[PDB]
Design a protein around this nucleic acid. Structure first.
Length: 105
DNA sequence: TTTTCAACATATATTAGTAATACTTTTTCTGAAGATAAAATGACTCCATGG
């Protein structure tokens, strides 16, 4: 009622439309970890707006750490700036919220 | 020393998306006495040659 539910995180997805080498991308990043022995994909994160999201080998991705949409597609595009700066063409396609997190009392 | 705190942390459950692997299942799919008989016993006889 007078108290509004809150947005914790929002999960989405984006397809880059091209497949890359997670090894090659793992070479230049500030936020990266890649161990297929542990998990087959690479860690991607940022300090602001404090988002992780995700990356795949096939060139798709999941979006996490987004408290709102102004941060999400913002960050979603930004994580592609390493690639289009370093890796392949990797456009921004198929952006849809996979889930939204919220909490209140 | 012991006790209460605390505190640190870490699972625990949801909902996702992957993607990939590994791992269990499931579902085919084959590799008591006196008749009755069976056979060994034996005699009979056809039929063999030879002096």
């Amino acid at each position: 009622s007078g108290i509004v539910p809150t947005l914790q995180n929002i999960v989405a997805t984006v397809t880059l439309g091209c497949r890359l080498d997670l090894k090659t991308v793992a070479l230049h990043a500030r936020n990266a970890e890649y161990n297929p022995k542990r998990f087959a994909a690479v860690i991607m994160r940022i300090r602001e707006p404090k988002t992780t999201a995700l990356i795949f080998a096939s060139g798709k991705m999941v979006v996490t750490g987004a408290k709102s949409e102004d941060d999400s597609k913002l960050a979603s595009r930004k994580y592609a700036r390493i690639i289009q700066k370093i890796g392949f063409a990797a456009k921004f396609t198929d952006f849809k919220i996979q889930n939204i997190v919220g909490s209140c009392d």
